[PDB]
Write a protein that binds this DNA or RNA. Structure first.
Length: 49
RNA sequence: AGCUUUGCGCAGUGGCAGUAUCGUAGCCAAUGAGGUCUAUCCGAGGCGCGAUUAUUGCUAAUUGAAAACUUUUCCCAAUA
């Protein structure tokens, strides 16, 4: 959970981070990995990661 | 100090639509209305009833009128 809080702080302070977003996909549980974790992410950026 | 964004009225000009606009002391609703897409996603009014030339006024023609018609004791047949 603390990892999730730190990831939320990191994304808020540093958006458009390809590696951070890619890793935040796999912090989130499987039900929420697609509908919210990767859609708005692809909206944010298109990094190779 | 100019410019500029949003909301709100007040006007002015112009365009489009008339199978639609409006009403709610009726009910329900961000404590979730409503869900065919894509649903660990979408997020706002809906439902019922009522009004109507499918918003409502005036303006001006026309028609219907209205004003009138003798708006007053006739006929077939009987007798003197």
């Amino acid at each position: 959970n603390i990892a999730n809080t730190l990831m939320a702080k990191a994304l808020q302070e540093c958006p458009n981070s390809g590696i951070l977003w890619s890793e935040a996909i796999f912090l989130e549980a499987r039900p929420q990995r697609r509908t919210k974790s990767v859609d708005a992410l692809k909206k944010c950026e298109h990094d190779p990661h």
